Structure formats: structure tokens, C-alpha cells
Amino acid sequence: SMQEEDTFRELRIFLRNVTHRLAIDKRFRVFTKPVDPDEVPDYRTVIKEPMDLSSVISKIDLHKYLTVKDYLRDIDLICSNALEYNPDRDPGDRLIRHRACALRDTAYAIIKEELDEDFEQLCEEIQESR
Numbered sequence: 001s002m003q004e005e006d007t008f009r010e011l012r013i014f015l016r017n018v019t020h021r022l023a024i025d026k027r028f029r030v031f032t033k034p035v036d037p038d039e040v041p042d043y044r045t046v047i048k049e050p051m052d053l054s055s056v057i058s059k060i061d062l063h064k065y066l067t068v069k070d071y072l073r074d075i076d077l078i079c080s081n082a083l084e085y086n087p088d089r090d091p092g093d094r095l096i097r098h099r100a101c102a103l104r105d106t107a108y109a110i111i112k113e114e115l116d117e118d119f120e121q122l123c124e125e126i127q128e129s130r
């Protein structure tokens with residue numbers, strides 16, 4: 001229905017606003033573009049599903065997300081990829097891991113304060129009807 005298409009258009013507006021707020025934070029600059037495959041050749045040998053905030057913006061616009069749950073699966077992938085590629089004790093790996101955990105915790109905190117639980121349940125029920 002047009003009412004359902006209006007629901008999904010409000011979800012995309014909400015997701016673009018959250019993603020922009022993460023992408024302008026100086027801590028998260030390292031998550032704004034893909035890891036460069038010419039400059040980091042063993043990256044895509046280890047990480048089988050690369051993800052970053054520019055790719056997330058593209059996915060919102062391609063109508064890939066019907067729920068905030070499916071958006072948070074990609075934010076969790078950005079965080080898990082950084083934890084698995086950079087696992088060592090040295091300061092450069094520890095700084096990446098701390099920033100990845102802060103990106104995930106920040107996204108979940110914005111969603112807890114600003115997403116209505118009944119709006120999310122509506123998106124889940126339209127998705128499950130298709």
C-alpha cells in the first residue's frame with residue numbers, strides 16, 4: 001500500500017540521519033570509506049564481507065533495509081570486521097578496536113533514545129508479510 005511505502009520512506013530518512021551523525025564524528029573517520037584493496041592486499045583475503053559507512057548510505061538509497069534490525073546487522077559487521085582484522089596488543093590495533101566498539105555503542109544508543117519501538121514493530125510486520 002502507499003501507507004506501507006510511506007513507512008519505509010520514514011525509515012530511510014531516520015537511517016540516513018543516524019549514519020550522517022556517525023560519519024561526521026572525528027573518531028570514526030577510519031570507518032567512512034572502504035579499506036583500500038591496492039594499499040592493503042591481505043584485507044579481502046581475511047575479511048570476506050567488507051562494510052563501511054559510505055556503503056551503508058548507498059544500501060539505504062537502494063532500499064536494502066526494511067527494518068532497523070537489518071541496518072544494525074551492517075553496523076555490527078563494520079565493528080566485527082575491525083576486531084578480527086586488528087586483534088593484536090599493539091597500540092594501533094587497540095585504538096582501532098576501541099573506535100569500532102565506540103561506533104557500535106554510539107549507533108545502539110542513538111537508536112535506543114530516538115527509535116519508537118512501535119515504528120520498528122510496524123516495519124518488521126510489513127517485512128514479514130512480503
Ligand SMILES: O=C(C1CCC1)N1C[C@@H]2C[C@@H](CO)O[C@]2(CCO)C1
Binds near residue numbers: 035040081
Ligand atoms: O581495519 C581497518 C580499518 C581501520 C578502521 C577499520 N584497517 C586495516 C588496515 C591496517 C591497519 C593498520 O593500522 O589500518 C588499515 C589501513 C589504513 O587505513 C585500515
